[PDB]
Design a protein around this ligand. Sequence first.
Ligand SMILES: [O-]
Ligand SMILES: [Zn+2]
Length: 258
Amino acid sequence: HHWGYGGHNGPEHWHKDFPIAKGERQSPVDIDTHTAKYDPSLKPLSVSYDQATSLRILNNGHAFNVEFDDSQDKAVLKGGPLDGTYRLIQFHFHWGSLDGQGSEHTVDKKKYAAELHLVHWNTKYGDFGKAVQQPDGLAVLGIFLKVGSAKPGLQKVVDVLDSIKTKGKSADFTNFDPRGLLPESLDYWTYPGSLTTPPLLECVTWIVLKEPISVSSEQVLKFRKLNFNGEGEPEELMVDNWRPAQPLKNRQIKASFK
Ligand SMILES: [O-]
Ligand SMILES: [Zn+2]
């Protein structure tokens, strides 16, 4: 793999190695709030993170992942549009070089400064690698970030970044509680889509929260000091690691709220 978010290997190039980039169920998308339909049939999401076990944070060269123990049903997503039970495997963010861009989903073409993705896989498929091969294999909870007041539950993440500055670096990241990254409301939009990184597999039920969380400018500044590169290599700041909105095609975005 040689894809990234640079001047020569970014989203507009991905289709050469990953032709599904131009597919029928690609993410992210712009959410036109007037066209999304309230679906009174949709349930409240069930976000069950009480028993979550965070383990490690890893700079993978494109973002940082906070990894969880997904060997048992500890931290699970159920309900909403979903059937069955989806285990949290990791979360990460997408962000910009400046506050005016960074989110992958947009809302009436509005870009947020960043977007958090909590990635979960369907336990009926047994492992993550099997799940990504199935149309109902993943459930990703998307949460927008806007810049204003600090998010206290984010600071443990921001404080560790200096220890994983470069690609391939990891640090212990036990005892982190992802419930502190949620907004107050769980109202959401949902649609069928894909991973937003190569391999771009069309295996995701997207659940995007309507209420953004507020983070401080200092918190997002610290995301922007990370590096895409490896140790000792020419410094390339980890900024603008977002794929732009893709065509909606023959899809309907459903709202949980009226
Ligand atoms: O992603
Ligand atoms: Zn993501």
